[PDB]
Design goal:
The protein contains 6 helices and 12 strands. It is of the alpha/beta class. It binds ligand OK0 and zinc ion (2 copies). Pfam families: Lactamase_B.
Length: 231
């Protein structure tokens, strides 16, 4: 009931929301094709450091995110992972890299970001090119579920907290439309959701790329949203 909504966050401000011990989401807003949308990422405590998942969608938002983390948490962000190549995930990577954060993404995401003219994470994450692949990265597991919202989309699990961050492959419960599907695989998306459901059956919190966290029901809801879009 306290998660911040789009009309509560002016463009350029970032909120943090405590999900579990050592796990936060970050929430920002951005204008795109003349409409404002909220967007989520993740922060995970990594001893006396933090791991960031996704930018706050833009250079100014990402600078505000680092300032909010400094104020609220006070531990340095040392690494960041972007979960796909679009601007709500990589826009702000240059700000992170100037702030000394080591930025990472799969080779699939890096090639697509490059081709798109988007910012490119520095380092390549091998071991994620096949659907069902999983790799450990600090306090999280990165999982490639297969093509869904994009061909390169990753999801992130925090085993200590049973938190699943789905990024843009997972929609919030109130969603009635599939968002930007220009780079999506609408036929594979339900199968990729099924793989996530099978691999993370103990997830307690599921965080979508945009909107409110909930439970495991966000996964089936997302498959349903995608099916309604398809027909
Ligand atoms: N990642 S993206 O590329 O495709 C994207 C961008 C971007 F800036 F980054 F260019 C801008 C806006 C959106 C966007 C995000 C959410 C919605 C809908 C909002 C109401 N409930 C159903 C979903 C519509 C659009 C999206 C997006 N994310 N997930 N689905 N679409
Ligand atoms: Zn996207
Ligand atoms: Zn998105």
């Amino acid at each position: 009931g306290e998660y911040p909504t789009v009309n509560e966050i002016p463009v350029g401000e970032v909120r943090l929301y405590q999900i579990a011990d050592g796990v936060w989401s970050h929430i920002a807003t951005q204008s795109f094709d003349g409409a404002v949308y909220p967007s989520n990422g993740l922060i995970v405590r990594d001893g006396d450091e933090l791991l960031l998942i996704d930018t706050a969608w833009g250079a100014k938002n990402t600078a505000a995110l680092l300032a909010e983390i400094e104020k609220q948490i006070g531990l340095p962000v040392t690494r960041a992972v972007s979960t796909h190549f679009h601007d709500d995930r990589v826009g702000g990577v240059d700000v992170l890299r100037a702030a000394g954060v080591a930025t990472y993404a799969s080779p699939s995401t890096r090639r697509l970001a490059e081709a798109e003219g988007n910012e490119i994470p520095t380092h390549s994450l091998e071991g994620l090119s096949s659907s069902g692949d999983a790799v450990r990265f600090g306090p999280v597991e990165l999982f490639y579920p297969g093509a869904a919202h994009s061909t390169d989309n990753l999801v992130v699990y925090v085993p200590s907290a049973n938190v699943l961050y789905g990024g843009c492959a997972v929609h919030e419960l109130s969603s009635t439309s599939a968002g930007n599907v220009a780079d999506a695989d609408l036929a594979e998306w339900p199968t990729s959701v099924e793989r996530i459901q099978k691999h993370y059956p103990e997830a307690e919190v599921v965080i979508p790329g945009h909107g409110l966290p909930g439970g495991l029901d966000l996964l089936q809801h997302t498959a349903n949203v995608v099916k309604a879009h398809k027909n």
